[PDB]
Amino acid sequence: MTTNYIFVTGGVVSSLGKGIAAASLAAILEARGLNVTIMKLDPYINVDPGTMSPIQHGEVFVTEDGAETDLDLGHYERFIRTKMSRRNNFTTGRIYSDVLRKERRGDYLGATVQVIPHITNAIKERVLEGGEGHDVVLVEIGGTVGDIESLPFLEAIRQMAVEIGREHTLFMHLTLVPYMAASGEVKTKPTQHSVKELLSIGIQPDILICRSDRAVPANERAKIALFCNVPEKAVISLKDVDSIYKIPGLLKSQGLDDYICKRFSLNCPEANLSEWEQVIFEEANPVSEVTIGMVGKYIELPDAYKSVIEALKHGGLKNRVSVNIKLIDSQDVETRGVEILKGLDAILVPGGFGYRGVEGMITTARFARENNIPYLGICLGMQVALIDYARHVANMENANSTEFVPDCKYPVVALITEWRDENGNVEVGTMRLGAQQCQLVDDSLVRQLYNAPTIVERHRHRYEVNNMLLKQIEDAGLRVAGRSGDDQLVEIIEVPNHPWFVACQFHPEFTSTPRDGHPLFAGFVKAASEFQKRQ
Template sequence: MTSPSHVTPLVFVTGGVVSSLGKGIAAASLAAILESRGLRVTMMKLDPYINVDPGTMSPFQHGEVYVTDDGAETDLDLGHYERYVRTRLSRKNSITTGRIYETVIRKERRGDYLGGTVQVIPHITDEIKRCIVDATDGYDIGLVEVGGTVGDIESLPFLEAIRQLRSERGPESTLFMHLTLVPWIAAAGELKTKPTQHSVKELRSIGIQPDVLLCRSEKPLPDSDRRKIALFTNVPERAVISAVDLDNIYKLPRFFHEQGLDDIVIRRLGLQAGPADLAEWDAVLDASEHPVDEVTIGVVGKYVDHQDAYKSVAEALKHGGLRQRTRVNLRWIESSDVERQGIAALEGVDGILVPGGFGDRGFEGKVLAAKFAREHGIPYFGICYGMQAAVVDYARNVCGLDGANSTENDKHSPHPVIGLITEWRTQSGDVERRSEESDLGGTMRLGLQDQRLKPGTLAREMYGRDVVGERHRHRYEFNNRYRTQLEDAGLVIAAKSMDDLLVEMVELPRDVHPWFLACQAHPEFLSTPRDGHPLFIGFIRAARESKAHANSAPATEVRG
């Protein structure tokens, strides 16, 4: 391997005992403290699954697919990272076993290995190390999370690669932080340290001695258990950190700082850093702990039994509330239930959000949710598929286009108001339908793209500027053949792509509806607890106003 011009100190975060202990949030919390001390921080996720990326994985199994500025489809942990630190990540920051093997095999086919036998060591591990160096070079510190649990066969190449990096760089520029479980056994009335001891033993058996232990537990870790863990794991007692369950994940930066975790890392790696300034995080917690209002938002989706599929949406809604000291209660509504139960499933909410998704299951429930919000003056926020549902509703029930649909769900719709961009094209101002074979050429629109907002619209008011960039992840678009017809019927095209070809946002006029906006992009990916996002802040404000109005006057029906 070639050494970078600047050797970035690295913190490797591993997990033991069981999965889902919160390595990503723990690592992001440490990164937030280090950033508050003036360091330029980056983060990286090494995922052991053989998929090249999670883009084709089921949301029920894997949760949300997070999207970066450069269009990488990544694990949801990158969403945690970007919510805690201000560094904007890229495809370099998310590596999978599948991607590593794909790269190595491509090199082998090109003859880069000069006919040699290609092996896990050194070829796979060298490629992992190259990716780590490439993603972290130029920063003051990099935090690298290894997915999975120590002992999993899938994680072994990654663990071997980080072991080699320690050997090559030395302990002065690498630190191993291991997150384990210290379970509370109710029958015995005590915490048990043995699983942590065995997890560290497993880690040491492959040549990695942890420098810091984060001990996840239901109860605070007693000093006696801390000393016992330190003794049996060869980790200094002060580096055995309690990671007790907290009711708010944004408390973790302050909680770890009070235990001196950041001081341990900075001293161990010889970093020059100022004092921690956690004022912004304290403000987040203060707003969260002392709300002055609350609203209930109905999230109408098709994966609500697996809410990690909407992780960024849920967090962005809460962030929108934090900016106005409002507690946001989420009511998860299965869109298929709306199809079965009708509007009864939607009663009692202060606002309705319909998030993204794919496929026809539950789509009609999303259309009904958009229709209900439109007709009853309830604040509506449609994201991606939620925008498409709103357009379909408007086409059917305001424009009278019977059978209007997306070609994703009905390829023979008489009015395909939503379709693949390859199903229509613009020539000299005319838009025409292309052949069905063009479906094969449909591609995903991914990553950050600019759009121009229309003056005088709700969207322009929310953002406060003319051009904004948002991240996209979708295949289907508003069909330009129906632009004029829907606009003539009152639908406002609030934003378009910079080349004027693609519809990015639609809304209803304020004299028709108090707050009805839908966007093709995914603004939830750019929301953070410290800053929020203009659309989510505006939506929650509208929900507050709707709630106040409903409590002071009889409900009125509003129709577009």
């Protein structure tokens, strides 16, 4: 058949939850047996978010192919089984970089290179590249209709709709319908004005998704329909929900997938949302409760840890354990000591870069190891666990990473090219990104949990365990639970004189889903439940 496109735009404000709405609609369509994908067009000038700081736009998501992407691709993978790659996310920066490359080396044959057709052509080419082969492609346009930054994306998708044909293309626009407490009604005026803004760029929306802190009533939806040239049945209410896993059900109950399947002439069975109903059921029927402390340096922006927070909740689902996630600043552990780590059933130290707040994480790893509090360390969380054990068990005073203290005597963490021992003796793309096969060691906690000899997890780090100093830490009782590659790089460590102490170099949070959970997070939350019971 001919691939169909749903272009998803946002009006009035950002932070509408456009990724989650697009992902939720994708989940309904996939549950009708359709081959569906999603792609994110970001109006940022960054060629990719690989440079970007976690405390700016949130977590840097990593795909299998090692692309550094917007955290929305995390939402996409948690809602649909279509695996994301580089071609599901691109920026204005990427588009201009490509056109500039082609221009400087004569591809345009002396032409004036213009926003139209050259920038718009490059956008359309990347949409087609990511989309063609699928039944339905959701194309999420970042930025707000009415702003400068999204205009080339909007002009590009306007052209695509005409070329491909309106039998194969739909415009789905999200707006804010805010509640005015003073008047006790939700307001359609921003929707009315946002639709006129979208039309002024050349796009008639086919479907309006109305974000509000409550259902948009029939009268307000009829008024939006009346002023926006949209059928009343294509005006959809997407209220604030306590669980994003409910959104597929809410959209399906308003016939959104039926409307799309009719417009695209797709003859497919009714969506079976049993898998989402199950996740909701699990969430609403916990048997016990745990408090897990996430001790990191980016807690001021929780979205810095989006996938980790979701992974912990998924750990809860599989154990019927309600997880109270307590975000704790590692700098507060440096200031106020281990007093603030009290009342925790488990401690997670997530990924990060830079020395700021790391000594707090090392102190935190110490506290969890000594007091037998279940511990999961991710990337930096593994480094601080290795440093902790190197210093306080293997008696390597001031043991550190070359990232933090370049000239330290015991660089137990360092770049492969920097590897040295305590006497400064040496051996005879440092950045690891995306899916890597990891060999699990027999009689390791993780080799049981994963229940396989080999696993595939995703990396985003350059600072490795120093193999030259590892043997001394192994003598002192630290277990290597996982390795990878020719250089036998350390992937997982365990402290076996402890009910549950695991730390990995990879980001297991990136392969966790609400439906399939994750062996490591399920095990971590189980251990948290067991600890809570023993108190």
